[PDB]
Structures are given as C-alpha cells and as structure tokens.
Design an enzyme around this catalytic site. Sequence first.
Site, short mmCIF file in Angstrom:
data_model
loop_
_atom_site.label_atom_id
_atom_site.label_comp_id
_atom_site.label_asym_id
_atom_site.label_seq_id
_atom_site.Cartn_x
_atom_site.Cartn_y
_atom_site.Cartn_z
N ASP B 2 44.61 -24.00 -44.04
CA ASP B 2 43.43 -24.02 -44.90
C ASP B 2 43.60 -24.91 -46.12
OD1 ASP B 2 45.41 -22.23 -45.42
OD2 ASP B 2 44.10 -20.56 -46.00
N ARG D 1 32.84 -16.81 -49.13
CA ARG D 1 33.47 -16.03 -50.18
C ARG D 1 32.47 -15.40 -51.14
NH1 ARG D 1 38.67 -19.95 -51.77
NH2 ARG D 1 39.42 -20.22 -49.62
N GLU H 694 38.58 -28.24 -46.16
CA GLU H 694 38.92 -26.82 -46.27
C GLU H 694 39.63 -26.59 -47.60
OE1 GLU H 694 41.01 -25.39 -42.89
OE2 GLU H 694 39.62 -26.25 -41.43
N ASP H 695 38.88 -26.12 -48.60
CA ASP H 695 39.35 -25.70 -49.91
C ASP H 695 39.89 -26.85 -50.75
OD1 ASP H 695 38.75 -23.07 -49.15
OD2 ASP H 695 40.80 -22.70 -48.45
N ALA H 696 39.91 -28.07 -50.23
CA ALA H 696 40.45 -29.19 -50.99
C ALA H 696 39.45 -29.67 -52.04
CB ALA H 696 40.83 -30.34 -50.05
#
Lengths: 107, 99, 422, 99, 60, 149, 248, 731, 125
Positions: B2, D1, H694-696
Amino acid sequence: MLLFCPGCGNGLIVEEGQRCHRFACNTCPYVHNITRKVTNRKYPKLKEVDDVLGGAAAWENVDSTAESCPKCEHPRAYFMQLQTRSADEPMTTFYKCCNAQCGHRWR
Amino acid sequence: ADFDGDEMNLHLPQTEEAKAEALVLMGTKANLVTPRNGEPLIAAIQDFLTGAYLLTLKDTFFDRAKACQIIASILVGKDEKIKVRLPPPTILKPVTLWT
Amino acid sequence: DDPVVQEIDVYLAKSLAEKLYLFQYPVRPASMTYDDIPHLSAKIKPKQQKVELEMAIDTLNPNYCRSKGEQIALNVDGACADETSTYSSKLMDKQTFCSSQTTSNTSRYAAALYRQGELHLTPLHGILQLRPSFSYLDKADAKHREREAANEAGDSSQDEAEDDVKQITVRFSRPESEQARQRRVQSYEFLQKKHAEEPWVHLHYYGLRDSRSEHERQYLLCPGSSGVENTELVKSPSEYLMMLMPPSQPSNVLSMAQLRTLPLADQIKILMKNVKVMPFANLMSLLGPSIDSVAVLRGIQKVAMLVQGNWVVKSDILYPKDSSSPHSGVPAEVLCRGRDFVMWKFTQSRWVVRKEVATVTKLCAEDVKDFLEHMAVVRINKGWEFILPYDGEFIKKHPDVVQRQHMLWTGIQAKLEKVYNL
Amino acid sequence: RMTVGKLIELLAGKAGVLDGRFHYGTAFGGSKVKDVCEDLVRHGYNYLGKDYVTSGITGEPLEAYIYFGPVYYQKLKHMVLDKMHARARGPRAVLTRQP
Amino acid sequence: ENEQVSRSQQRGLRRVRDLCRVLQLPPTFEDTAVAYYQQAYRHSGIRAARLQKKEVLVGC
Amino acid sequence: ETLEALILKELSVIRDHAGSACLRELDKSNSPLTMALCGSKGSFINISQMIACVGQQAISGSRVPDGFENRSLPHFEKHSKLPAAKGFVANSFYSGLTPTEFFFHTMAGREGLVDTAVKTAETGYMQRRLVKSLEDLCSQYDLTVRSST
Amino acid sequence: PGTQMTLKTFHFAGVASMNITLGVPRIKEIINASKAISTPIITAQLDKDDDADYARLVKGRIEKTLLGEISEYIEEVFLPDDCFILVKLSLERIRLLRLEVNAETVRYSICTSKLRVKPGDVAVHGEAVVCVTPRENSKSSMYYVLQFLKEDLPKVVVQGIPEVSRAVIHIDEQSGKEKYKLLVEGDNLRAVMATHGVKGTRTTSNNTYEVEKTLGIEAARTTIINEIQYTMVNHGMSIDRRHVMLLS
Amino acid sequence: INVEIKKIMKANEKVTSDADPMWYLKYLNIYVGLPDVEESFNVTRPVSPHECRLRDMTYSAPITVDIEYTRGSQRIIRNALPIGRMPIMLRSSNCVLTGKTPAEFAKLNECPLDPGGYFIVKGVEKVILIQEQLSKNRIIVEADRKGAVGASVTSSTHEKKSRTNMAVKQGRFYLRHNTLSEDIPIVIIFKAMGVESDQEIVQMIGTEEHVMAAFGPSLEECQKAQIFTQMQALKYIGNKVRRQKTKIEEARELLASTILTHVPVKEFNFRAKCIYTAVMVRRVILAQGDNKVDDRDYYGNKRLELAGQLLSLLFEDLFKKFNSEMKKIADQVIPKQRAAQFDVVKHMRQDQITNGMVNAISTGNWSLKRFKMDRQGVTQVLSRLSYISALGMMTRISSQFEKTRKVSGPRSLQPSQWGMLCPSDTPEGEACGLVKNLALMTHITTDMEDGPIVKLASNLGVEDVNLLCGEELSYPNVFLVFLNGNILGVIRDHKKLVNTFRLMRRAGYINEFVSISTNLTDRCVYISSDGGRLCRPYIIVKKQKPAVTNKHMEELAQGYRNFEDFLHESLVEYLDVNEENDCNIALYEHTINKDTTHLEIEPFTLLGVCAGLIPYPHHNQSPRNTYQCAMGKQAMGTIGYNQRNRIDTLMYLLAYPQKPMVKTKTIELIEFEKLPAGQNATVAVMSYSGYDIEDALVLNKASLDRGFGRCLVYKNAKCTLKRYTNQTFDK
Amino acid sequence: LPKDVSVAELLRELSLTKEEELLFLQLPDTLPGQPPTQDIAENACTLADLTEGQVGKLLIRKSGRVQLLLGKVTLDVTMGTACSFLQELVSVGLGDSRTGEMTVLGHVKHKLVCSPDFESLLDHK
Ligand SMILES: [Mg+2]
Ligand SMILES: [Zn+2]
Ligand SMILES: [Zn+2]
C-alpha cells in the site's frame, strides 16, 4: 426437605425404628416419629418451547426491501455489512436475493 | 502493498540456471492469475479504474489535439516502433470529436 | 411533619448496669423457649465472660431414643466408673450450652423496657451467644484412646513387671528467642490455658415462671419525676459533631478555608497577590461582614495602592527582593520600577500604549505584556484599558485615603521622573 | 477511510489563513462549517474550498475544481536513507557460516 | 587458581572489598586494591601472619 | 433476543433508507459517488455512513454490551434498551459524532484490530502446518499424483 | 483465504440460533481430524417433510428427554409404613410434545445404570404415577440414600438418544414446497439414521470421525470436501474443488 | 521520599543478633538530602540533570541516617552516616529543577517545558510505567475450564499472599489452597472454625429453597464421614496439611493466619471468617443459576501502582537484605575476633543499596524474593523523538498479562475506561490493547488512614456481624457493607447510609477520594479507600441544576477561588468507576433530566495527550485516530529549548517548524504550539501523473528547494579512555 | 410477614394493646453529652456515665418519622435486623462471691437502631 434437630442443630435423617419410620440425628438420641403424610415437591421446569422456527415472515426481519441486486434485480433482498477486518480498507457486503427462489449469496 | 512505508526485499541470483528458472516460472506475465481459483490478480487498481471509467463515459468528446495527445502519451518504449492508427471520429459534420 | 402524638419519655437506670447480660440462641427460634426445660447449673467467670449452661432433658418422652442414649452414655463414660461422668444415670440426661463472645465493648448497646408513656434504658455488661456445645465427644474420644492403650497393654494374659523406669528426661529450659516466645504467647494453647487459669463460679437458674423473675424485673425502672431537666446532654450540635468526628491531628496553593484561618493582614496580602485587581466592596464581601472596615482599609493600604478608585497590589508584593523575571532574568527592582511606571500611567490616563511603555522602561515585550495583562485588557483602536471601571463611590466615601494615595503617587512620580528622566 | 475531519481541518485552516485567525478543532465541538464557510465567502473565495485551477502541463483549465487548502503535514522519522540496505558477500557468523 | 584461596585470604579480600565500598570508591579502585593485595600475598612471610598483620596490610 | 432483533431491524431500516435518500439526492460528477460506482475504492455503505448516517455499531454481531451494571455507560438509565443507549449512531461523520457514539466506534475498531491480530497468527500457524504436510506431493508424468515414498 | 477470512459472526445459517464454529477455527478442526469437535451438526431428512406432526414425533424420538423435563412433580413421601419417591408424569405435556412415553416406558427407563435398582423396587400405581422404593446396598449406603436419588432421578433418560443433546425442526420455504428436516446438535449419526421416520439415505453430519466410522472412508472424504467448501463459501471467497479434493 | 521511607525505616528501626545479647543497632531518622555528585575527592557538589546526561552518570542523592549502637556496651551515637544513594526523580520535591524560573532553567541547561518525572541513570533516561493489576482481597466468581462456576480470593497482606479457590466440581463445594494436599469440603472447614451446628451453617449460607437444595449434597457428604466436632475437623485438616497434637495446631494456624489473611481474627475467633466464607458460598450458589459471572476487564476492580509503591517495596527489600547482612557479619565477627569491640560502622556497606537501585532502574527487572515477585520491563528508555512522544510515553500504562495469551478480552475497549483512559490512543501492533494512555483529566488516588471511615460507619447504625447470625444475611432488605474486601457489617435502608456518607465526604470530614458503591444484584455496599483507584472530577447536580454557576466561573477566572475551593464548597467531587457505576452523569446541560446526579465537565477530556492533536477527531474513523497517535508518537520536531546542548544517541529536528493553524484546546494546554512537530503546506487534493496511486503523495521541487521539509539528524559517537588495574592508561 | 415500621410498632404497642414489651436499641458510640465529674478530653460518653432520671424524649412526627431528642440534637430511630431466633434478656446478679442469682427478665423480639441526623448537624453549622 432439610430438617434439623432442635437439641443440637444437626441434620436429621430418615430411618426405621421398632414401630414406624422416624427422623433422627447421628449425634443425639433425639427422634421424631412420623404421624401423617409428609411431602416435598420441587415442581421441575417443563418444556414449553414448541421448537418450530424458520417462517418466511420471521426470517424477513431485515431492512432490505425493494433494492436492486446485480444477479436477478428482484426487489426483496437481504443485506449484511461487516467491518471486522483492518487489512481490508473498504467494508464487506453480503447480499441475498430469494424473491423468486433464487437463493444468491455473494460478496 | 500500500506504499505506506513498507519495506520489500530484492534478491539477485548468482546462477544462469536459477535466473532462467526465475524468469520462466516466476515471470510476471506468466503469473497474472492465482492458482487458487484462476482469477487474475495483476489488474487495474485505484486511480486506474476511476480514470478509465471517467474516460469511457458517454459525456466524453475529445477534439483532434487532445485525442492525439492522449494516444501519444503511451507511445514510449517498445510502442515507439508501431503506427498510431488514429481511429475515425464519431461526429464530424458539426464538430470533429473523438469519443 | 410535626410531632402530633406519641411523645414518649426516656428514663435511665443504673441498678443492673453490671448485672445485665444478653443471651441469644442462634439455633433456637423465638417460638420455642427454654421456660419448660429444667436447668441444673451455670458456670461463669467474672473476667473473660464465657458462661456454660448445664440443663436437664427428659427421657420418657417419645422423642428420645433410649437405646442410642445407652450407647452414647457407654461411649462417653466407662462401664461403672462413675467417678467423673458427664451423665449421672446410664442415659444422656445433661445438655451443655457454651457461650461465645460477640464483642469486647458493649457500652453502645442497651436494653429498653417499654411501659405506658415511658421507655427505660439499661446498659449491658456483656453479650454472649449460646450454642449447643459438643464436649462429650472429646471425652468419648479420650476414653476410646485409653481403652485402645489398655487393649495394647493387655495383649498377653499376664503382663510381666515392665522395667520401664522413667529415666530422668529433664529437658533444658533453653532461653527462647523473642520470635519463638511471641509465637508461643500467640498460640491457641497458651490462650486456652490462660482462660482456664481463672476459677469457675457456679450459679443456679431461676426461670421466667419463678416469682424471683418478676421480683427483680422492677429493677430496670428508676424512681424519678416525669419532667426533669438533665444537667448533662446539653452540648450544641457543633460540639457533638466535633466529638463524634475528632480531627486526625502557584501562589493559589492555600484555599479559601485555609485563608480564613489566617490573620486579616495575611488574608489581604494573599488576596491581593492572587487577584491583583479588586474593589473595596468585593474585598469586604470576600473577607466577611463580621470584620470592621477600618481594619481592612489599614491592611490593604500597606500592600495595595489606589488606581482610578480601585485597588492594585504593590509591585514589591508580587516580586520579592530575591525573585527575578521568569522571561528575561532581570532583577526584581527593575520589574517593580516598570510596574510602578505602568500604574502611574494608568492613574494619569485610562488608556496606556504598550509601545510607549516599552520604549520608556527599556524592557522587553514579554515583561510589558505581563505587566499589562495583570491590570488591563486590549481594546481595539484604543490600546489598553483598565479592567475595572472608575469606582467613584469609594473615592467619595474616603477622601483622606484618596489624598494620602495622591501624595504617595506624587512621590512615586517624582521617583520615576528621577530614574527614567521623564 | 471516511476522513471528513481532514476536509474540515483544511477548510478551517483556509478560513484562518484568510482572516488571520486560529480555528479550533476541539473534539465534540470547535468551529462549525457554517462559520468557516462565511469566512470564505467574505474574503471572496469559494465556500467549499474548491477553486478554479488551470493545469500547469497543458495550460488548459481543468474540468473539475481542485480542493486547495493549508494542511498541517508532519514528517516521520522513517527515512529511505536509513532503511536502504544492500548486502555483498560480507562477513558470516562463527557458529553458523551465514550472514 | 582462585580455588587455592585460604579462608584467611578470602577474609582479607572481602575486607578490602568492604573497606573500599564504605568509602564509596569506584570499581577501578577495588580492582587495583585486590590486585595489589594478591600481589603482596605471594610472599611466604606475609601469608604466615596474624589477623592484625593482614588487616593493617589491607589498610596499607 | 426478539426485542434486540426488532430494534436492530428498525435501526437497519433507518440506515438503509437514509442511504437510499442520500444516493438519490446526490448529483452526478460527485467524486465519492463516482469512485463508488466504478468500484475503485469505497462503496455506497461508506458514503451513507459519512454523509447520511452511521450504522449500528456491532460488537461480535450484537449491540454494545453493558460494561457497567445493567447499562453500557453511566450517562444512560439502568435497564434502558434504547437504540442510542446501546450503540446506535444517529449523527454522521459530517455532522460529528457524540462522545458515546465515538466511544462505541472506537470499541468496534479495537475489536476489529484485535480480531485481525489473532487471525494473522492463527492463519500463519495453520499455513505452516498445511505446507509442511502437503509439500511432498507432486504431479508425475503418468497423470498420477504420488507422494515422495 | 484464512488470512482473507474475517472471522465474522451472526452467520446462523438462517435459523437465528445454534451458534456454530465457522472460519479458521472450523478449518482447523477439520484438518486436525479430531474425534470430538465443537458444536456438531447433523442434518436429517424426513419421509413426510410436509407434515409438522410427524416432524415433532421424530424429533421427540431422536431428542433426549429427561424424567424431570416431563414429570410435573417428584416428591419424597415418608409414609408411616414405608418411605418412597413418587413421580407424577404430565400426560398433557406428553401428548403436547407427542412423546411415546407412558408409565411402563418410564419404569423400564429406571433400573438402568442407577445404583442397580431392582425391578421390584420401581412400581406403577396409576396411569402416570411412578413409585420408587430404594433399599440399602450395604456398600456404605443406607435408606438415607433417597436424597442421592433426588439428585439424579430427574436426570435419567426415558426416550431419545443419550448422545443427542438438542434437536430442532428446520423448515425450507421453497416456492414449490416447504419441507421439514431435523438439525441435531449431537455426536451420534448411526442412532439418528436408525430412528424410525428418518430418511437415513440423505443424512449428513459435520463430525468427520463419525462419518468415517459409520459410512466408510469415501463418505468421510465427501463430507470433508463438502464441509470445507461450505465453510469457504460462507465467507464469500471461492476455492477450486481440485484443491480440497487433493487435501481430502 | 517524604513519608513512606520514614515508615519503612521505622518498621526496621532496631536490628540485633542472637549471639552476644544486649547488642543492637537502632535507627533514628533517615534523610535523602539534595542530589550531589561524588566526582570530587570525598566532596559533594550540586550537579544539574543535564550534566548527569552529559557525563553518563546517575542523578541521585546520598541517603544518610542517624543511628545509635553499642560497641563495647558503651552507647555510641552517629548523627550523619551515609548509607546509600537514591536516584532523584526530576521535578520532585528534592530535585534542583523544582521552584525554578525559565531563566534559571536556562542557567541549568534544562527546558522549562520538559515534563520531567523520569530518572537519569548512567546518562540514560528511564521512565517507570504505571503498572496495572487486579484488585486484591476480592471474591471473583468465574467459570473454570470444564464450565464449573467457582470462586477465587487472593488474600494479600503486608507479609504473605495466598490465592484460595472454591469449586463445585461434584455438586459440592471443595476449598482448594496451596497449603493443603487435597481439597476438603467446606462444611468440614466450617466445623473446624468454631461453628459446629449444621443449622447455623445453613442459616449463614442462606434460607432460600434453591440455596438449601444446592447445599444439600455438601451436608450429605459431611454426614457420610464421622466429622461432627471442631477437634475431628481440625485433625482431618492436619492430616490433609502439607509438610512445610501437632497436626491440629498446624491446621488451626493455617485456618487462622494462612487461609484468608485479609480477614482478621481477634483471638482465634473465626466468626468473621465464617461469615466471609458463608457469603462466598452464597454468591457461588446465586451464580450457579443465572449466569451473572463477574468479568476481569472491569476497571472498577483494577489497581494502578505508580513508581512510588514499587520504589517503596524495593527499598524495603533492600533494607531488609542490608539488615540481614549486617546481622550475619556481627554474628561472624563479634564472638571470636579480639578484645577490640566490633562496631557496625566499620561494615556499613554503602554501595549495596546504591547498586541495587541503579540495577533495578537500568535493567528494568525486579526480583523481590521476600514477596516472590519477578517482573520485567518495569522501566523503559524515554523516547526523545519529539515533545509529544515523551509527553505521551510519560502517561503510559502496561497490563499485567504482558502478552501471555491472545485473550482479546482485556485487549478490547471496555466501557469502564470512560474519562479514565484514552480510547483511541494505543500502539498499533502486537501490543494493541495491553498498553494504554491516561485521559487528559484524570487522577490516581492514594492510601488513607481508614480510621474515620470505620468510625463513621459504626456511628451510622451498622450493626456488628458478630451480634447476629447469618440468617439476616438472607433477608432481601439487609445489605452487606464491606471495607477493602473485609466484611464491615450489615445495614438496612442503604440509601440513607450512602446519602449520608456522600454528604459527609462532600462536607470535608471524610477524604474526597474514599469511594462508596452499591450492588443491588449482590446487595453489597462496597467502601473503597485503598490507593491506585482512578477517579474523575464531576460537577454535582442537585434538582436539575448544577451547583456551579456563571458567578463561580467568573470568580475562578478573576482569581477569587481555585479548584480546591470548588472541591471544598461541594461543587465538584471525585467519582470512582465503582461509584460512577451507580451515579447518573449528564454530557451537557440540555441532557440533564430529573434523574441526574453529576455533570460532565468537558467531553473532549475523554481523549489522551496524543489523541488531542487530532483536529476534529469525531469526524474520522477510530483506526485512523489510532494510526495518527502511533505516528505522532514517532513525529519529527523540536524537543525543547535545550535541544542544542543535549547530546543523545539519535535526534531528529525540523529546520522551520510551524505551529498548526487548526489547534485543539489540548494543544494550548500542553503548550505544543511552543514546540511544533510539523509544517503547514498548501495541499491540493487531486490526482496527478498517477504517482499517488495508493496512499502516496507528490511533492513540489521548488518547495523542497526553498526549505520545506528540511530535516536534521544528530547522532552521537562516544569513546572511553579508561585506566586498567595496572598503572597504564589508554592514550 | 410484612416489614413493620417503628411508628406503627409503637402505635400498636401503646394504642392497640397495653402489655409491656422489651426492646433492644443500639445507641451510637458517643452521646451528645459530657461525663459528669468522671475525671475526664472529648472522650466517649456512654450510659455508664449518665445518671438516672429523664434523659430524652421520643417524638413521632408525620409521614413515619421517629426521632429521639436527647438535648439540643435529635437522633433518628429505625428498625434493626428482624431477628427470629430466641433472645432472652436475663439479669445475672452476683450478690455473693460464691453464689449468684440469674434472673430471666424477659424475651427480646424487636431491635431498634438510633443514629445521628448528620444532615441536620451539617446544615445547622
Ligand atoms: Mg503497508
Ligand atoms: Zn440432633
Ligand atoms: Zn434480484
């Protein structure tokens, strides 16, 4: 029932004497003959449940009504939501559609 | 993965036979599907599903310049030795727009 | 909820204060009593009260097993020894009740006899719980042990004269360690022997049906008039509460309760140190109306100054001679001079500019900010305004105080013009 | 989220840097959305944070507005320089001759 | 070695230890003191003496 | 249990109806709705929780158990089986959650975290055993799977 | 899939009760091949799946019923001539539950692993009256062992399988017809198949050891395959049948 | 260091040897003094904590004591004799940092915003985490492995700890203890403890029909044997007594002292112990029906041991060991040395206690043989990653389990943690749920004298338990009153008792930390006065209106009153978990109804220190808040005003730290804005170039070039040049 | 048997019947008085220090209030634990150092509890 001797206070047992059945203690010569009938009921719990279950009206205790599923798009449905996984960032769905006796079960 | 700070390992084989077996058996193109149920795991992901969805929407109508730019955006590497093959436009009489 | 009826009086009697005992049977309900049971004796001790009742039980009643009686009598005692027998005849005839001590002190317990319109209280010398003791079984076990010893000795029909002369096995009276001595003292056997050291006293039993019972029942009463004012029992509720509950033995550490216990000068000093800005009426309300105003004024004049009708604590009170600036580390004298200059500027004009004070006093921004926050608030487009409004009432009420504070401020202004070269 | 709190913090920070104030993100309270929306509409900005933005690459405006705002980002001690590792033949252990 | 240590030598080294401990000395002082004691105890005339001699030797 | 099931059904009805209303009132070109339609990230449930209403906090497939005596929190009456007193979250993430709802959500999150923590170890041990047992089999050339022996 | 499984709850398989271990613990209990598993489930098919009376009849036949669960009162009466325990059977509750139990079946239930009570001790006076008169066994036991009987007399089995603990009537509401089946939370498949009215040809179970011991090794393999596939499908994840076939 | 150490010294004030009597060593008074350094030759010198950090030494103070002894029967007195060195906690009463101004902090090279409270040993900063354990002297009813619902009681006194259990494995109650060979029936113990009549035993157990039906088998099994008197039962127990009439005495001693140590017997009077075991049997019988099993995760039955109690136990153990060593040295030296009279001063080893304390604080393993306590991980290295990191690690609490098994029970978030511990703040990983943080507004109580409590309870009409039989325990209106696990007595109409006790506590005659709770299910009134209990302040609400008004808050803001004035004027009072279990608390003023007893001060106080940094945390998810707390514990930023002179093994600093624009009130409370650990950047939420899948995140080159995100890493390299035994040195 | 109350108890003991009754009330540890010339100190003042005569009054207010005025303060009387076992109040008089007399005075049935009204003592000052 549980009976005790007025003399010493120990538990009384039931034995047979020379004339009749009597209560007596093991630590004193105190005795008590039985004159009339003595009973001690307990009234145990009886089975009251008929153990009949599974009715469609009782089974359809769910919110899902008149939705659209990607399997048979029937109105009546049955949805369940699960959030018990931290590795899976999104949530989890379980939809069932048995309006026309399809019986789907997917994610 | 992730991309949240996870560390990954990278190994280099020291044998030609091991290198060939790794490239053949453990090739990325040869393991596009999992042996559990045959479902493909190496596929589109976030920011690729949404992008392709917004691209293939019916509201999308691109002129010649934007369509040519979006097509040329992939003409790198081994795609530099192939023809573009610009498809014919859908609407042309009012305005020439490529969907 | 007024006391409409039932205004019963309470009397006290000291006739049977040391002769009243409470006997309760935890195993005998209140329905069946021992009035018909003929008692025989009662052993008792004055100190360490533990009474043992010895009563007699019938035998011809159908509720008694004569065979089991003979069996238990032959078990507890010998065949025809009869020298020390727990029963006179060959049957279980005597019953023993043993007493256990509930508590050591019984002064808080009292027996109440109720008569028409009166209730007489009598203290209890002791309370004991009577339970059926099992002591004949211990003597029966001892008898069985000695019979087993006799059977062991009688293994042969004729026992030769044993040469079992008692060799002198006199053990050393070793000096016992203090720990082992305390263990021996705290042992149950030592306590039982100490209790047994006290001789027993035998007493006869007089039932409730006896005339002596009704004769001595009148001793719980006391000869006295109906209405008599008791000399004692006249303490106030506060004194009673103090009796039944005896005592065990930043700058705002001291609370208000601890503050009120301090002298008036200390109270005023601590209040001026904590608040640093307060009127005279608020101070009189906080200190209390029972304090004279002249004393409070003379106390506040020593640690505070008059600014626009309000009272501001002096600079030296907040900053002692040994203290320093927590932000810059400058000596407390400079802080006192700066605070006096700020207070003088406030007395001259209600609006004070922070930049002018910082320029004149040559101090840093944080010190001037702390000086202003103690007695001023920020007003937009106007600068710093005094937190409390002009209090002219105290000025009109005390003109001499106003004149004295005016001349003190004149002297302070002279000193400030000498120092800062205003 | 479902991190709506991040959007609320962004909006409050934008309103604060516009009007020169420090909004509070107190739990079960703090500055509401209506107040920061009024602060945004008063200074001439959008009441939802989304502003008209032109793409720097192509020089053409974007079809959708971009959500701009000051966010309090904090750097963590996890660095790639300290975590980057490479192992040659190198030494081995005395007991078991392994790295 | 350290097993051929007489009861008197053990008493002497323990005396050195407690003497340097009651003075709150660092462990380096204790090490140097026990080393000097073991070095001085190598003589035949020193090992064969009374407790007073061993105690004053610890002191020195 | 019948009352518990009925209350859960009513709360789920409220939740799903609020979610349907929010999905119907939302206009297109909405980024959360767009990402939910294409399935890239999120779903309609998360949108309904963050916009319309958070769902019933379920611990071990049931409502919040009474941590205190006959009640979950001292802020509610004793023997009170009200929805808001047993885990229901009336407000959404946009409007803000009450302290009780936030505490219940944190309880559910910690339950999920510890469940995953135990699951990881259990599945690791199970996988180790399964691989150690099954590593001997192999497919031969005669189409018959044979062991090492 | 073990890591992919979330270990959820509330998966009562449509009966809203009978909590069963599913997920990684279930896979572990399956692969361990333990003789005794947690919460065993036995599914039995009925010959008359449309009648509820026959369903309740076969349920009472297979379900263990204690003496205290059917008797309305048990009293230790000490008459001046003799002392004995009188048990009054509730015939109304018996005909309500449709149990084939009378005074004779109750009398036959006694004298079985109960301190060797002789047949002459137990007697029947009325239609639903049982009189038990125990005797001293001389093995440190006297007449005042009556109380001991009071401790275990209601806990004697009069009808049903002792291994069966709870049996419920599950119903399927298919549009064609609503059929009735038996869900037994016991560990005895042979007894369930041997009972009258139960179609043993279509009876399954969750405990692999019982299936192995009763219907052979191939039936055990098929049961393992079906149970693993069902446990995997319950979590929404699918596995090719060849893997579970190779494992079995 | 001010009260408990004097009590420990008084407990062992006199030490003497058996041989050569009339010899003794009497301690008079022990002092700890100010922290000093023994660097100078036989000279003490004041040393700052920063100097101790630099020189890799310990920050301790010399513990001395004045004594009197007998050398040659001539009494010699010593007024100042050092005996050890106690490490001084920072910002304590004797620490040099207290009572100092920020300028004086700068003169000492110490940050004024430093929380302190940590020890400095050999140059490293160690923090003693708050230990969490189960409450002692309490009956716990729980199910066994086979499903049997039994009871357990861990009676722990100042000397011995013994856990005795009771089971119903075979329909009868057997009592199991570590000092018995085999578990014995409870009726035999009843007969051995004085009460011999079975009727009294049954009355003490209970008068309910089901109670007698359950207790019947026990009476039958007791009547099977020939045990009918106290002597026979004591002989049977002594036969069952394990090796450590003599057997009867040993059985009586085990029943009086070893079994149920917390229950005191005046003079071999087991009446209180009989009532206690009868109440325990009654609770077991009541629990054998409806499954009202008590839970271990209920924090009302938890106790928190701070560093004070641990240090007290350690100092007591060390002092006992020192006294034993001194007595052994005396016994070995005095009888055969010489006419030179032996004295203890020549053998007062001063390094024993010092080395013990240093090792116990540094290594972190605590081995107390006198209490058989073997703990590990008590002290931990203080994390100097940032100010928030240390401020959050200072208020950490570890669990007693310490990852012995993945129970998931205590690891879960219990509702009892309301207002006491932070729900979201927990380390992500294997220690999830076992390491917790205290709330923003919380307090831990200390031990009281328990005298006036007993006096007020006796004066409030509580009848003595010895005056009445156990039958009154079976009445529905009679409620038992306890005291720290000891049966205080019985009472009727407990509502009046509770109201009077609460009013007396509010008045000030009773300590405000004494908690009182009532359990209607068990009908027990618990009065807790031991230390370690968690309490929370609440505003008292009387008749739908809080006692605190706007005038009181105005006086507080102006400085007329403080929080202690609110405590004294019956406005705000402390509530314990057990006490708040029976009280009604309102979150806000609009939530106040007729049945309300207290009001919540502030809801955002539910979160801890780290969770307070989260802007608008009620709009986010709980795992997000947990991850945010975990990353803030590792956030990079400034440490303090003395971060330049500080030399640590690893330090991370930010070039241009900026305070957040959206700051919580907790941030202003903890003064985090003075020491920020991040920067405010103009973030645009959008997708760009597909390098943030992804979350970067994508960073701007010009921003990083102009100083954004610039960081500094400071490492330490230490070398030592020590002199060996020989006269040679490292050069 | 319903749980009786002290007010109705005294009412039925005086109005419904005239027969005397023996009660056992529990007084507090310290009475609101001072030991009269007992050589002291704020020590405990029990009945052993007080003299004979009228020492207090028993008031029965409305709504079931039963108070005891022992001077300036007023205690409250409530019903104690309802004992059902035999309680015989006897008088053991040791007239002689060798032989004494035990006099059974009566039977004890009810138990009373007297407690200080702490609420009134607190609101007073
Ligand atoms: Mg990751
Ligand atoms: Zn008897
Ligand atoms: Zn459908």
